[PDB]
Amino acid sequence: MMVWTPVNNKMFETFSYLPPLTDEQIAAQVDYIVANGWIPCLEFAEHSNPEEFYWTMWKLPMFGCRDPMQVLREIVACTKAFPDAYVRLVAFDNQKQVQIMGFLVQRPKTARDFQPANKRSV
Amino acid sequence: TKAGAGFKAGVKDYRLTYYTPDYVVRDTDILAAFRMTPQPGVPPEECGAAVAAESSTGTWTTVWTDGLTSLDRYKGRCYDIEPVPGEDNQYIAYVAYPIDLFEEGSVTNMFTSIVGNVFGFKALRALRLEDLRIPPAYVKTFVGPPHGIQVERDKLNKYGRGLLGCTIKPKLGLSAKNYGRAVYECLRGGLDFTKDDENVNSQPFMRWRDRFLFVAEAIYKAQAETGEVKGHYLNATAGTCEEMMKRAVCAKELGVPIIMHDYLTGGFTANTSLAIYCRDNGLLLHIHRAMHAVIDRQRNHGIHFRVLAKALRMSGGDHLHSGTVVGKLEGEREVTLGFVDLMRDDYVEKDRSRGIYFTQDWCSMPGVMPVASGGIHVWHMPALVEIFGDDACLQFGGGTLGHPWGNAPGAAANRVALEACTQARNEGRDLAREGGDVIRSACKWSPELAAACEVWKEIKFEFDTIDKL
Amino acid sequence: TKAGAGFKAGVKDYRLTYYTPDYVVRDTDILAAFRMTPQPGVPPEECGAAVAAESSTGTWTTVWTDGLTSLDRYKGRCYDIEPVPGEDNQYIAYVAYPIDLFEEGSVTNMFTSIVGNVFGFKALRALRLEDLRIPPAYVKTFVGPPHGIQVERDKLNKYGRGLLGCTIKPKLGLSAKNYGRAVYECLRGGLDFTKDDENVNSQPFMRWRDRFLFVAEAIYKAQAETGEVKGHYLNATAGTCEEMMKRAVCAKELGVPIIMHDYLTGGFTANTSLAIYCRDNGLLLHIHRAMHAVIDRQRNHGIHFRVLAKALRMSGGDHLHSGTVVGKLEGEREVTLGFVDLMRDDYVEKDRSRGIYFTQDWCSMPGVMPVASGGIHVWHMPALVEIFGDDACLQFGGGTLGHPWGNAPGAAANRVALEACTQARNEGRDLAREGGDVIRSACKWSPELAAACEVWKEIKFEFDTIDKL
Amino acid sequence: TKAGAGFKAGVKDYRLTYYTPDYVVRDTDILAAFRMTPQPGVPPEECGAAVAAESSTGTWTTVWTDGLTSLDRYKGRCYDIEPVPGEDNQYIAYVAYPIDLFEEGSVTNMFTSIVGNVFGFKALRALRLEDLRIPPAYVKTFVGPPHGIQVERDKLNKYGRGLLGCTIKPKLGLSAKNYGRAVYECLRGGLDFTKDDENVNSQPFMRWRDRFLFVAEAIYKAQAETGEVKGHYLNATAGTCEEMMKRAVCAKELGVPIIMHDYLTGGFTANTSLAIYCRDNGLLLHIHRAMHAVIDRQRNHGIHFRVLAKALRMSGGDHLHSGTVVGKLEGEREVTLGFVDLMRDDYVEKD
Amino acid sequence: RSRGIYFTQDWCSMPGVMPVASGGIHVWHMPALVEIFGDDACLQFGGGTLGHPWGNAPGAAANRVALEACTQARNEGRDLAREGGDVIRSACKWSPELAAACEVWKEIKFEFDTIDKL
Ligand SMILES: O=C(O)[C@@](O)(COP(=O)(O)O)[C@H](O)[C@H](O)COP(=O)(O)O
Ligand SMILES: O=C(O)[C@@](O)(COP(=O)(O)O)[C@H](O)[C@H](O)COP(=O)(O)O
Ligand SMILES: O=C(O)[C@@](O)(COP(=O)(O)O)[C@H](O)[C@H](O)COP(=O)(O)O
Ligand SMILES: [Mg+2]
Ligand SMILES: [Mg+2]
Ligand SMILES: [Mg+2]
């Protein structure tokens, strides 16, 4: 029996219970956005609290973007400008008018409030 | 200067007034598809006409008062009858009802006409309401769901995957303190929701308000620990409207984001009131369909679940249980896919291969989140993600509280399984074919999931389907 | 030092915990009799156990939380299984539920446990709840009917005969002014009551408040003209509890003695609230059973009407439709006599020949007045008086408004027929044998009755019965 | 991987998005017919498109937020433009509005979109809303009139002839006691109704509750004397909703069968509330159209009375003034016959 | 009468209502708006914000800079009716957010014959 730790075990919604996403895994997610015709967008924040609905938009949603390389370049640009911020990639569906995917692509390095995968239970 | 049509006392055939095979249906008519089994010697046209008559304006003998009004304007009309393939004595009778027959915004009234008396007529052996065409002009008279799928996701700030829930167990017999204990341990391991069992209301072993308070503490603690928004569907189902409202009011005061209601055992009148209260107060409303299988299981008689689902959508609910297909309770794949579309989508074309008898236009009424619940576990995850997609909540009660390491590891196992399937799908993997591989890889990586994989490895629910198309 | 019973994760058979054939039922247990059809390969003991488990404390796999409470204390128990004569795969499974499982005064809660989920289990092909034993200790938690038979008669000042009612027709399509017109003409001819059709709520052709006002005028005029107390069941059935209550409040304001509610389409939660309101305000409450046959028609699946009738008695109603036996809707004689006793009497002994599976003690909860309505006319009168006795209301909608001379003559015909039969019975005449002679003599004497006799002379409703014991 | 339609900042012509002459109207669309007079140099198609845009989803420059939603689904659409016979610079522009644009049961909201801002656009010289097609799916969202013609006749027990009424005069300046005096003498001679003047509310010369009580006495005396059902439209028109309701409640308590309201000076929001109250309490509701001619007199600019009448029908009223044709206030015969049909009938064909 | 005021109006201390200038205005209009209304007004830019090429926050900033530059210039004695363009041009050169707004709407004017004339 392993015990799931309550200590510094914060999660960040979709994909946080998986191993950290590789560059190839992130790229595959971006392909999924493009294949489905959804609108990519980046958002960022100094802090991440479950009670806080809005983050700050990086520029504007990438309307009409069908180029995965463009999305990956904006990830680099956003994280470069805010190297200590939480950054997430999201995508919008304008037909249902709702966010249709989203996951973290950066966390602060000074953050020690979450566990590596093999340290989540003791 | 002859006499026109006058009052003639006595009995004549219903078909003389109520079978109109040349009737062109109006865009504002409510349409019904009845699977009808006549008694020997009762012509199908007379049977369909009887059903149309006694669900609209007619009775068993001629009444003089018809002359004061216009029967043509108000009568229900059996406008088509088709034989059922593979049956010698089953027919689909199609009945059109003028919009004037119905009280605006009242599912109760609609059911009272269409299914009120006709199922007990001696002249038929069996009757099943298969589908209803709710016209936009009638749909528009309903408040509808308090929020609906898009608004719900926005209120939860949850995107990109199915939601995960869990009924606390044992069903009955736990104290309020133990209920909250179980809830906290469940939510902290990665579940978005837990819930009261449908029959957990207020009882000698656990009074409702004691539960509500402890569950609120549990929600808050798990939310703070995990950094993710949590909820627990607190049951407002009660013996009276006043008790039900008291419970909803208390949940609102506690600031808990979601409650539940058993719409069929509580009833449509109570449910509509509750839905309106939830709209007026920003409460998410989970609907449990307790008692539906009493009505909807048998092919020859009752009301198909798709009609009970449409009725809930109208009365109002943010979630509604949809079956699992693969779990402990019945629900055939194509049937389920059909009513899932009817629950979620804005416009659903007629498709008899999915049990959709009419094209349904919901005219922007919000979609209802399907909830797959009942005897499912980690090995079902790929099939569930494949069937439902992201816009569903998947619930694991036994599949969480039955985990050998307890609730938090159980929740973690389910959350890892869902996320691995979601990722795999997004990457282009075919879950119908490679689902087992996705779970097997995930089991090897996550010790919590592995423990779940081992205990339930052999467990399947495969039986002959009763509710077949 | 060695361990006792610990937590073991995984699936085991329900029968290991939930089949207890040596259990001695307690006098406070709720008992259920399920007519159960297992899937091939599922032992009846496991099927019965699954039903008991999943309507009480259990789910599909073992949960650790059982250990925090006492499953012995709370679990539902299948304590007996009998094969059904003439069936190879049907069994009556008897389940006992501890009183602690149920919310006091809540029919909604009792149905949610007993009929909530189990009818949809894949492991069974069909399930029918035949009967419930409601123990006095649970019965005592319910307000029950607002008045009951004896109080009702005292409030109406009516004694010594069946009551007479009549649904206004056409069902829908009449204006408020025409509704009141029909009502006045009906009541003034000798009917005690008229009523809204079950589906007459509030609609474009007739809004409810307009109707309520005209009907009140009609009641008052007919009462003053005849010198007898009159009533008309104004329909409170509505889309929401708030609308339902608004209607009941208006009826009270108008001083009308009686209202009606459709308890199944409105729902038990709304119905209980309304019954309490009726008790608190001295309103008689007529209950219409719209939708019951969706649930109670088929022998193999659903809930027998006797259970729906017990549930209504608990939730609350002064009248409840009982069927006619001889009219247009189904109801077999012995089955009907059984549940009529369950509706009216204080103590009813087990009697399988009448579908009574358990001795039922109502511990002085008031009796509900049976209402025989639907496709009946003057020639049925002797049979009706014979079946029901005086404690019933007999309703003639078409049998009044279908009279060739109009409503008042139609009412008079029914009243004369009822009184002739009543007198004959009181004189020692056997209505079962001499009923035709009583009506024939009455037709020769009363021209109003004669006209009814002639028009409906040949009209009978005789069909093979679906709901057979 | 070449880019699709993205966000481009700046001003472009409204017609690029909002003039859709091939659009097939949906049976749930609200349709408007605008009599439009463009400024010199403004193409009618651009003018029609500007009207459609700024009464639905659009503003004067391109906004990036359009991309988050579906403009196709929500936009108003100028779908047809016809020149007006006998005019060199007047056009009828037809605009279709999706049903999703409107709040259910709210005339206020419908007017806010369709007539809210567009009449003040510099780019036009004049605008008149001539007609609206209210689809059944939108009509069904309204409570509508408290009773309507047939129910009213049944409640009054009056059949087979026109009803007769009479405004008390002088308009203002009579005491409550003299008001009731005049009412009784009027009603006893054979009138079915009398009424407060539109501007008789509550004033220093006569407070409302004093009047209501005297009028109730007059109604009762005349009804007893003549043997015929009498009424007097007591005015609930007030400065606030709360005063309005107070007045209606008092009329109800007195058992008087009918009240009145000035729907345009009181306003649609108050009027709808009042109509609902009248439905819930069996009060007949007489609607006075005070201020309509400010809006509806001129051919080139405003809103035709037929639209104001449709709006009243939706908001709720049992009576509505229609004009006389032959009396002191304007109302051409054919125009009047048209909107009278629109007020009374169930189905009225284009004409 | 030259301002359409037909009667002397005494409000006897009833509070004043804040005028709101809104509808088809952008950064280049700022000097004229400040000159017409003074400080006791609210100036609203819907399209003039949500139509900014960089999104809402830059759009808002451009409007706020423009308003502040005009306000400062006025307080310093500058004649906004005459030098208003110069104030905006200076501010565009200084603030990249404003510059982007200046460029996009540079040519945009609404000048038509007036219907509601005195
Ligand atoms: O009482 C139960 O069995 C459940 O709590 C599931 O528990 P488990 O998660 O432990 O199976 C759900 O209420 C059922 O799934 C309802 O059935 P349905 O969704 O078909 O209406
Ligand atoms: O709607 C009808 O058919 C009735 O008004 C009968 O009309 P008639 O008197 O003209 O037959 C009653 O509601 C039915 O008897 C209800 O059925 P039950 O009593 O079986 O529930
Ligand atoms: O709906 C519009 O057009 C506006 O939102 C402005 O939008 P933009 O800022 O995008 O121009 C305002 O409501 C108008 O100013 C109203 O006109 P007025 O102020 O004259 O009453
Ligand atoms: Mg449950
Ligand atoms: Mg009926
Ligand atoms: Mg006047």
Residues having CB within 6 Å of any atom of ligand 2: B 54, 59-60, 117, 120; C 167, 169, 197-198, 289, 321, 323, 329, 373-375, 395-398
How many residues are listed for chain E in this entry?
Answer: 118
Question: What are C346's two structure tokens?
Answer: 């204080």
Angle value at C-alpha D136, between D135 and D141, nearest 5 degrees: 105
- Among E28, E104, E111, E114, most D C-beta atoms within 10 A, so best to mutate, is E104
- If you ran DSSP here, which 8-state letter would residue E28 be given? G
φ/ψ bin of C310: left (φ > 0), alpha (ψ from -120 to 50), beta (otherwise):
alpha
Find the D288 Cα to ligand 6 centroid distance in Å. Answer: 8
- Pick the closest to residue C272 from B147, D236, B267 (CA basis): B267
B360-361 and C30-38 beta bridge pairing: unpaired
**From CA C212, how far away is CA C196, in angstroms rounded?**
10
Q: Is C195 annotated as a binding residue?
A: yes
Q: Is C198 annotated as a binding residue?
A: yes
- If you ran DSSP here, which 8-state letter would residue B114 be given? H
For chain E positions 26-45, those within 8 Å of chain D (CB to CB) are: 26
Q: Is any ligand 3 atom within 6 A of the Cβ of residue D59? A: yes
Q: Phi and psi dihedrals of B229, rounded to 5?
A: -60, 130
In sequence order, the β-bridge partners of residue D128 are D35, D302
- Protein residue with least CA distance to atom 14, ligand 3: E23
Element (H, E) at A102: strand A98-106
Give the nearest chain B residue to C455 (CA atoms): B10
In sequence order, the β-bridge partners of residue C91 are C36, C83
Ligand nearest to the CA of residue B329, numbered in listed order: 1
The answer to whether B363 contacts chain D (CB < 8 Å) is yes
Cis peptide before B170 (omega within 30 of 0): yes
D125 contacts in chain E (CB < 8 Å): 113, 115
Q: Is any ligand 3 atom within 6 A of the Cβ of residue E46? A: yes
D57 vs D53, D67, D171, CA distance in Å?
6, 12, 46
Residue C233: partners with Cβ closer than 8 Å, 6 or more residues away: C165, C193, C194, C195, C196, C258, C259, C260, C286
User: How many C-beta atoms lie closer than 10 Å to residue C160's C-beta?
Assistant: 9
How many residues are listed for chain D in this entry?
Answer: 351
**B393 three-state secondary structure:** strand
**B315 three-state secondary structure:** helix
- Pick the closest to residue C205 from D19, D150, B412, D265 (CA basis): D150
φ/ψ bin of B395: left (φ > 0), alpha (ψ from -120 to 50), beta (otherwise):
beta
Contact between C193 and C232 under an 8 Å Cβ cutoff? The reply is yes
C277 vs C149, D79, E116, CA distance in Å?
18, 56, 63
Question: What are C469's two structure tokens?
Answer: 């014991």
Domain C143-456 has CATH 1.10.3720.10: no
Topology of the domain comprising C16-142: Alpha-Beta Plaits (3.30.70)
Element (H, E) at A43: strand A39-45
Contact between B270 and B317 under an 8 Å Cβ cutoff? The reply is no
State the amino acid at position E62 in one-letter form: A
Q: Does residue D169 have an active-site annotation?
A: yes
What strands, in cross-sheet order, belong to the sheet with C319-321? Answer: C163-165, C393-395, C369-373, C319-321, C284-288, C258-262, C231-235, C193-195
Contact between C167 and C321 under an 8 Å Cβ cutoff? The reply is no
Residue C423: partners with Cβ closer than 8 Å, 6 or more residues away: none
What is the torsion angle, in degrees rounded to the nearest 10, for the CA atoms of residue D38, residue D40, residue D44 and residue D48? Answer: -40
Contact between C189 and C195 under an 8 Å Cβ cutoff? The reply is no
Residue C430: partners with Cβ closer than 8 Å, 6 or more residues away: none
D neighbours by CB contacts (3+ pairs under 8 Å): A, B, C, E
In sequence order, the β-bridge partners of residue D77 are D96
Contact between B463 and C39 under an 8 Å Cβ cutoff? The reply is yes
The answer to whether B58 contacts chain C (CB < 8 Å) is yes
The answer to whether A81 contacts chain E (CB < 8 Å) is no
C neighbours by CB contacts (3+ pairs under 8 Å): B, D
Breaks in chain D after residues, C-to-N cutoff 2.5 Å = none
**From CA B432, how far away is CA B326, in angstroms rounded?**
13
Resolution (Å) of this entry: 2.2
Three-state secondary structure string covering chain C: CCCCCCCCCCCCCCHHHHECCCCCCCCCCEEEEEEEEECCCCCHHHHHHHHHHHCCCCCCCCCHHHHHCCHHHHCCEEEEEEECCCCCCCEEEEEEECHHHCCCCCHHHHHHHHHCCHHHECCEEEEEEEEEECCHHHHCCCCCCCCCHHHHHHHHCCCCCCEEECECCCCCCCCHHHHHHHHHHHHHCCCCEEECCCCCCCECCECHHHHHHHHHHHHHHHHHHHCCCCEEEEECCCCCHHHHHHHHHHHHHHCCCEEEEEHHHHCHHHHHHHHHHHHHHCCEEEEECCCHHHHHCCCCCEECHHHHHHHHHHHCCCEEECCCCCCCECCCHHHHHHHHHHHHCCEECCEHHHCECCCEECCCCCCCEEEEECCCCHHHHHHHHHHHCCCCEEECCHHHHCCCCCHHHHHHHHHHHHHHHHHHHHCCCCHHHHHHHHHHHHHHHCHHHHHHHHHHCCCCCCCCCCCCC
Contact between C194 and C187 under an 8 Å Cβ cutoff? The reply is yes
B322 vs B243, B300, B312, B331, B354, CA distance in Å?
27, 21, 12, 8, 15
E neighbours by CB contacts (3+ pairs under 8 Å): A, D
Ion ligand 4 contact residues with beta carbon within 5 A: B 167, 197-198
Q: Is D225 annotated as a binding residue?
A: no
User: For B327, what's the count of Cα atoms within 13 Å in the CB-facing half-sphere?
Assistant: 27
Closest Cα of chain B to C4: distance in Å? 17
Three-state secondary structure string covering D52-110: HHHCCCCCCCCCHHHHHCCHHHHCCEEEEEEECCCCCCCEEEEEEECHHHCCCCCHHHH
**B368 three-state secondary structure:** coil
**From CA D213, how far away is CA B375, in angstroms rounded?**
71
**From CA B229, how far away is CA C243, in angstroms rounded?**
36
Breaks in chain E after residues, C-to-N cutoff 2.5 Å = none
- The experimental technique used to determine this model is X-ray
Q: Is any ligand 3 atom within 6 A of the Cβ of residue D61? A: no
The answer to whether D142 contacts chain B (CB < 8 Å) is no
State the amino acid at position E53 in one-letter form: P
Find the D304 Cα to ligand 3 centroid distance in Å. Answer: 24
**From CA E18, how far away is CA E35, in angstroms rounded?**
16
User: How many C-beta atoms lie closer than 10 Å to residue D339's C-beta?
Assistant: 22
- If you ran DSSP here, which 8-state letter would residue B118 be given? G
Domain boundaries, chain D: 16-142, 143-351
Ligand nearest to the CA of residue D288, numbered in listed order: 6
**From CA D283, how far away is CA D274, in angstroms rounded?**
10
**From CA D53, how far away is CA D47, in angstroms rounded?**
10
Element (H, E) at D111: helix D107-115
State the amino acid at position D182 in one-letter form: A
Q: Does residue C319 have an active-site annotation?
A: no
Element (H, E) at B30: strand B30-38
Q: Is C117 annotated as a binding residue?
A: yes
**From CA B269, how far away is CA B261, in angstroms rounded?**
12
Query: Which of 3.20.190.10, 3.40.50.1110, 3.30.190.10, 3.20.20.70 is the CATH number of A1-122?
Result: 3.30.190.10
Closest Cα of chain A to E12: distance in Å? 47
Closest Cα of chain B to A77: distance in Å? 24
**From CA E51, how far away is CA B438, in angstroms rounded?**
46
Cα-trace Rg, chain E: 16
**D268 three-state secondary structure:** helix
What strands, in cross-sheet order, belong to the sheet with B124-133? Answer: B77-83, B91-97, B30-38, B124-133, B302-303
Residue B408: partners with Cβ closer than 8 Å, 6 or more residues away: A3, A4, B185, B186, B188, B189
Contact between B128 and B302 under an 8 Å Cβ cutoff? The reply is yes
Ligand nearest to the CA of residue C65, numbered in listed order: 1
- Protein residue with least CA distance to atom 12, ligand 3: E23
Domain boundaries, chain A: 1-122
DSSP labels, B32-77: EEEEEEEPTT--HHHHHHHHHHHTTT--SS--GGGGGS-HHHH--E
Angle value at C-alpha B103, between C240 and C302, nearest 5 degrees: 70
**From CA B236, how far away is CA E65, in angstroms rounded?**
53
B468 contacts in chain C (CB < 8 Å): none
C427 vs A18, C201, C424, CA distance in Å?
88, 43, 5
A95 contacts in chain D (CB < 8 Å): 70
The answer to whether E54 contacts chain A (CB < 8 Å) is yes
May I ask the CATH architecture of the domain D143-351? Answer: Alpha-Beta Barrel (3.20)
Element (H, E) at B273: helix B268-281
Q: Is any ligand 3 atom within 6 A of the Cβ of residue D120? A: yes
Contact between E59 and E52 under an 8 Å Cβ cutoff? The reply is yes
Find the D106 Cα to ligand 3 centroid distance in Å. Answer: 21
SS3 content of chain D, % helix, strand, coil (to 5): 40, 15, 45
Give the nearest chain D residue to B105 (CA atoms): D141
- Pick the closest to residue B208 from B236, B249, B241, B171 (CA basis): B236
- Pick the closest to residue D232 from D265, D271, D289, D185 (CA basis): D185
Find the D288 Cα to ligand 1 centroid distance in Å. Answer: 60
- Protein residue with least CA distance to atom 4, ligand 2: C374
Contact between C192 and C212 under an 8 Å Cβ cutoff? The reply is no
**Ligand 3 pocket mutation pick from D62, D64, D117 by most atoms within 8 angstroms of CB:** D117
**From CA C173, how far away is CA C157, in angstroms rounded?**
34
Contact between C112 and B290 under an 8 Å Cβ cutoff? The reply is yes
B319-321 and B369-373 beta bridge pairing: parallel
User: For C322, what's the count of Cα atoms within 13 Å in the CB-facing half-sphere?
Assistant: 33
Closest Cα of chain E to A54: distance in Å? 14
User: How many C-beta atoms lie closer than 10 Å to residue D88's C-beta?
Assistant: 6
The answer to whether D117 contacts chain E (CB < 8 Å) is yes
The answer to whether A57 contacts chain E (CB < 8 Å) is yes
**From CA B177, how far away is CA B213, in angstroms rounded?**
9
Breaks in chain B after residues, C-to-N cutoff 2.5 Å = none
Question: What are C62's two structure tokens?
Answer: 């073992």
Contact between C391 and C383 under an 8 Å Cβ cutoff? The reply is no
Question: What are B285's two structure tokens?
Answer: 């409303």
Residue E88: partners with Cβ closer than 8 Å, 6 or more residues away: E27, E28, E30, E31, E66, E69, E70, E102
What is the torsion angle, in degrees rounded to the nearest 10, for the CA atoms of residue D184, residue D189, residue D192 and residue D196? Answer: -40
User: How many C-beta atoms lie closer than 10 Å to residue C355's C-beta?
Assistant: 22
- Pick the closest to residue C237 from C303, C291, C302, C175 (CA basis): C291
B248 vs B314, B316, C243, C430, CA distance in Å?
20, 15, 19, 58
**From CA C48, how far away is CA C140, in angstroms rounded?**
29
**From CA E69, how far away is CA E73, in angstroms rounded?**
6
Closest Cα of chain D to B405: distance in Å? 45
User: How many C-beta atoms lie closer than 10 Å to residue D1's C-beta?
Assistant: 9
**From CA B396, how far away is CA B374, in angstroms rounded?**
7
A98-106 and B30-38 beta bridge pairing: unpaired
Breaks in chain C after residues, C-to-N cutoff 2.5 Å = none
**From CA D250, how far away is CA D297, in angstroms rounded?**
36
Residue with tokens 């057979």: C468
The answer to whether C291 contacts chain B (CB < 8 Å) is yes
In sequence order, the β-bridge partners of residue D124 are D38
Ligand nearest to the CA of residue D60, numbered in listed order: 3
- Pick the closest to residue C187 from C224, C213, C154, C157 (CA basis): C224
Contact between D54 and D117 under an 8 Å Cβ cutoff? The reply is yes
Q: Is any ligand 3 atom within 6 A of the Cβ of residue D324? A: no
The answer to whether A3 contacts chain E (CB < 8 Å) is no
What are the DSSP E strand ranges found in chain D?
30-38, 77-83, 91-97, 124-133, 193-195, 231-235, 258-262, 284-288, 302-303, 319-320
- If you ran DSSP here, which 8-state letter would residue B14 be given? T
